[PDB]
Subunit: 250 residues, 2 copies
């Protein structure tokens, strides 16, 4: 059993954006299911649990020390690690934190890590094992050193690709050659005439999947402007928008 | 009219500390009214609202843009500013942020401030005015550049002093000479010998008030160990422990 739950599907600004009265933000206030907390996921493989990123601010209420096996981080932007701060001073055994070899980290996490063990840095395209789950780091195109991950068990493959703007060539080629059955993909922006710098727009994602050919692409890291667009425009077949609490099977 | 609310009365670790099952933490799990969120406050002077620090994670739910007048920051440790991150990308007019002239800030706040305006730096012992409220920055003893504040109206004087270990001489003397009727004070630890380095213990706060003689000292920034101690020991007359949500008029 490999499942993935999207615990947050937004960016740093979130939905609702603070004070915004656009159609998407008003909807999320009225109907909480449309709120989007910071982009993050929970992988359950057999008994083992991996927390992909740590942008939620209530992890300490969702989990106890030892109730999950490790963190897997994409990068050290605040919206992906701010949730580690209420955890580090906890009581319990060390908690492994797997992620890119970013030498600075975020604020004083590295200098004062508490129960978090950041020594578990990983390498592009070098597979590691999480309680049987095969994980491959994939370099992404972003303003910080950022890895996405291929997660594989028994030839079932899921790709976690946030945050990124149009994939590096080696990563694109690897994904084409290791076709994911499901790809969770940063698509912050509605379709644009130009590819944005740090996060994909819809047109970029469509272009990428013409090469990768994943049969199920789930868009995440959704901005309020993209939600507004989605309220009036349909996605093409094969693409769906993620939402907080979405459960993904294989 | 002047009201002060202690919206958070804990430190970075909080109460309950994650995974801790000591008497204080277990109590705070059974009864959330004993939880302590990061040290922060709200000052209301007539209609004007100042948010002191921004350690709470849900300011975006408590407030809308324009519903308060400014932030007043003591220092840029993460547990005092982490709540600004969910706000900066909002929709609204610029929000003044008053605070010490820390050149670095925290993470990328200064480079990418969004609606936050960090240009409102303040100076030790130089009074400034917030909608009629007279505010004096007071240097504190802490690992980052940190100011506490005297808040003064025609008849009332309240000091907000966190985070700090002891007080620098000029600040101590200023407080003795401008005796606060209420002093909200960092007291992270139960009575110790000696120090501590970055946050007061109870013996240090007692020593400071031997000089300042404020008639009402409210302890904040309380660690779980100090809470556990308080479950079994009384404080002297004139000292009380803050709680999240406590209102002071
Ligand atoms: Mn990022
Ligand atoms: Mn992001
Ligand atoms: Mn503090
Ligand atoms: Mn501090
Ligand atoms: Zn909006
Ligand atoms: Zn405890």
């Amino acid at each position: 059993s490999l499942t993935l739950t999207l615990t947050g599907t937004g960016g740093a600004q979130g939905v609702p954006a603070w004070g915004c009265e656009c159609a998407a933000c008003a909807r999320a206030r009225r109907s909480p299911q449309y709120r989007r907390q910071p982009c993050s996921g929970v992988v359950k493989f057999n008994d083992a649990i991996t927390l992909i990123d740590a942008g939620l601010h209530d992890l300490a209420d969702r989990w106890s020390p030892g109730s999950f096996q490790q963190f897997l981080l994409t990068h050290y932007h605040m919206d992906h690690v701010q949730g580690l701060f209420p955890l580090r001073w906890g009581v319990g055994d060390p908690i492994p934190v797997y992620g890119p070899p970013d030498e600075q980290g975020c604020d004083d996490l590295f200098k004062h890590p508490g129960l978090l063990d950041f020594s578990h840095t990983v390498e592009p395209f070098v597979v590691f094992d999480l309680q049987g789950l095969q994980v491959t780091p994939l370099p992404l195109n972003h303003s910080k050193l950022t890895f996405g991950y291929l997660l594989e068990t028994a030839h079932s493959r899921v790709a976690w690709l946030s945050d990124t703007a149009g994939l590096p060539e080696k990563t694109l080629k690897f994904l084409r050659n290791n076709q994911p059955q499901v790809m969770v993909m940063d698509c912050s922006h509605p379709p644009r005439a130009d590819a944005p710098r740090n996060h994909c727009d819809l047109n970029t994602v469509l272009a990428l999947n013409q090469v990768i050919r994943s049969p199920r692409v789930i868009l995440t890291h959704i901005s309020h402007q993209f939600d507004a667009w989605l309220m009036e425009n349909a996605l093409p077949s094969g693409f769906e928008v993620g939402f907080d609490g979405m459960e993904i099977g294989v």
